[PDB]
């Protein structure tokens, strides 16, 4: 469409991708260059032109938090406090959100993880639901990728829906472009205290 063409030519990634999907050259190359372009800085380190990072997180009636907002640094963010201040809760919330990107890079319409109806809703919350809201940034062509994971308490008749379509839309770009011509893909990882385990060389995974 002419509207998508204008936005795409202005540097919008989602519009460029939409045009690629409807006409299935130019638009493919726009998408692929958006993901692959970058330069080597003065220190000899490669830097992507379009960075990917979590900008902001909001927690509503989640575990101990009634309503909490956190702004994250692009490089390093360190959370500190006494035991039971919710530091591990914060990383759990983020990991579940990232699971939606991973699921959709692996499979079209893949399902990520969910908030627990047994444990994750704040015990004395008057509304009986929780929300975890995240915004991601992917360069100036995609400044905002909003996701919300939601869950209503066990028993409650009204059920609160998650909103994950933006995660799926972005992950689709990575998956589809990669299938046509290989691109570098983002790494998502959680290392919690469960990483301290006894080692066993004898146990081998025969699964994939």
């Amino acid at each position: 469409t002419k509207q998508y063409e204008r936005k795409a030519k202005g540097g919008n990634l989602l519009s460029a991708f939409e045009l690629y999907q409807r006409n299935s050259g130019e638009w493919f190359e726009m998408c692929r260059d958006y993901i692959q372009d970058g330069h080597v800085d003065e220190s000899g380190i490669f830097r992507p032109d379009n960075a990917f990072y979590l900008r902001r997180l909001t927690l509503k009636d989640f575990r101990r938090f009634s309503l909490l907002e956190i702004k994250l640094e692009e490089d390093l963010t360190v959370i500190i406090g006494n035991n039971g201040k919710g530091k591990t809760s914060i990383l759990y919330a983020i990991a579940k959100t990232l699971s939606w990107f991973v699921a959709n890079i692996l499979k079209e319409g893949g399902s990520g993880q969910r908030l627990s109806e047994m444990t994750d809703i704040k015990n004395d919350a008057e509304d009986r639901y929780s929300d975890v809201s995240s915004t991601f940034f992917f360069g100036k062509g995609l400044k905002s990728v909003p996701i919300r994971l939601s869950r209503s308490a066990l028993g409650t008749a009204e059920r609160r829906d998650s909103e994950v379509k933006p995660a799926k839309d972005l992950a689709d770009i990575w998956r589809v472009i990669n299938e046509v011509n290989t691109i570098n893909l983002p790494t998502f990882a959680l290392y919690n205290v469960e990483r301290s385990q006894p080692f066993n060389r004898n146990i081998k995974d025969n699964t994939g």
Binding site: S66, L68, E69, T88, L91
Partner: protein, 215 residues
């Protein structure tokens, strides 16, 4: 160093750890757990970034809970620097209880809970003190809200009590102040910072009193 041997008839990963060749099973828990983190992350980055000259310069978000887990203080002083140099474009979101780790990080990177929060706080903020390059004892008190000397130990208060006794007796060592002095000497030792402080107090207060008498 790290390498694979097959000559015994089973595939074994070996490492040179502190100058000694050992199996992974022989590593301490602290070393193994940290090795596991880095190995896993490096593997994933290599597999996901085939087109980069240095695949460890790929993009991504990595979450680490309790980065100081099983680490000696010496290692706590290196861990964040090493990670950031090896993975320069990853966004790291980490949690810590270590002032030693905080001494290596800028204040802008730190997010701190208010001390008596109760889960209604709306926005998290950075500490007022610059942590990067600061002394650990200052970070304890100014950022982590902990006394640098344990308040529940009586001996921790002896110097304060000693000073008060000295000031009660116009700066002269009385019987009571001498007893406490001897207790400090006996407990902390002849070369202790605490005894030096006590000695200093004696010297200063004696001189102050002499000045007062001249006046």
């Amino acid at each position: 160093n790290i390498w694979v041997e097959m000559i015994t008839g089973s595939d074994l990963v070996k490492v040179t750890n502190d100058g000694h060749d050992v199996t992974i099973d022989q590593l301490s828990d602290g070393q193994r757990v940290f090795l596991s983190l880095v190995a896993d992350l490096a593997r994933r980055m290599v597999m996901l970034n085939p087109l980069l000259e240095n695949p460890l310069e790929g993009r991504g978000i990595v979450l680490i809970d309790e980065i100081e887990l099983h680490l000696h203080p010496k290692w706590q002083q290196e861990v964040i620097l090493n990670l950031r140099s090896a993975f320069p474009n990853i966004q790291f979101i980490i949690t810590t209880h270590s002032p030693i780790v905080l001494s290596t990080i800028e204040k802008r990177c730190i997010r701190e809970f208010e001390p008596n929060d109760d889960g209604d706080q709306s926005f998290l903020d950075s500490p007022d003190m610059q942590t990067k390059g600061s002394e650990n004892a200052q970070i304890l008190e100014q950022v982590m809200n902990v006394h640098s000397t344990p308040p529940g130990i009586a001996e921790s208060h002896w110097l304060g009590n000693f000073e008060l006794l000295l000031l009660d007796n116009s700066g002269e060592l009385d019987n009571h102040s001498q007893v406490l002095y001897d207790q400090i000497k006996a407990h902390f030792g002849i070369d202790s910072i605490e005894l030096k402080k006590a000695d200093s107090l004696i010297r200063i207060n004696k001189m102050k009193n002499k000045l007062n008498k001249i006046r």
